[PDB]
Amino acid sequence: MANITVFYNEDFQGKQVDLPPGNYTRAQLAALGIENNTISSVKVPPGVKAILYQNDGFAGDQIEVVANAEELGPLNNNVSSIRVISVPVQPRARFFYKEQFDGKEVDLPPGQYTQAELERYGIDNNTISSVKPQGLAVVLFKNDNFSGDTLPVNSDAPTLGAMNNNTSSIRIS
Ligand SMILES: [Ca+2]
Ligand SMILES: [Ca+2]
Numbered sequence: 453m454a455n456i457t458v459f460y461n462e463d464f465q466g467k468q469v470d471l472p473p474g475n476y477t478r479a480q481l482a483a484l485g486i487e488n489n490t491i492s493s494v495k496v497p498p499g500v501k502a503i504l505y506q507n508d509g510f511a512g513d514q515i516e517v518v519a520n521a522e523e524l525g526p527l528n529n530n531v532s533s534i535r536v537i538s539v540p541v542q543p544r545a546r547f548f549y550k551e552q553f554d555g556k557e558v559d560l561p562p563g564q565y566t567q568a569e570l571e572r573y574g575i576d577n578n579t580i581s582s583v584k585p586q587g588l589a590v591v592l593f594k595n596d597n598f599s600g601d602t603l604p605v606n607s608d609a610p611t612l613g614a615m616n617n618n619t620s621s622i623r624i625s
Contacts, residue, residue, distance in 0.1 A: 454500040456536060458486070459493035464522055464556070466492055473500055473536040478508045481532065491531045494521040498561060499541045505533035519544065519559045523572040543587025545624050547574065551581040551613025560624060562588050567596050567620040581613040585624075593621040 454473055460466030469486050481487045496502045496517055506512030506527045513527040518539065542562055549555020558574040571577050583590055583605050594600040598621045603612075 457495040458491040475535040478532040501539040502536040508532040548582040553610040
């Protein structure tokens, strides 16, 4: 079983609400109570992929996630339509906050990421640090689109903090 859990305030903070998978709009939500600008943050575990839609009727800027979205995105100022569909379970990785696995963690499924969603998809510009792959290998790229120097994390690294300069793009192999 699965269920996406949103948050009322940004930063994963603010009252939360669990919503079962499937496709719905402001209609179903009207039945619950939450609607419009409220999904400030999001926590979606693996096994199921979620897709948000700003304007109702599944329209307006759309988002896609499978893990826990911290900052969510820029359109967090308006939400109502969403769509989630069961997805095959796959391993992933885990990044901590404070330098020394002493800060909230964030997971990210396999795949590549840029410098825009990545940050606003799990953490932010600079704040990752200590990393810990829960199954696959993580690779950090300094410059944008996986370019410039790189820090291939082919193993556990509960302590990186001051190392490069600012992880821009990444790739979980
Ligand atoms: Ca925010
Ligand atoms: Ca350290």
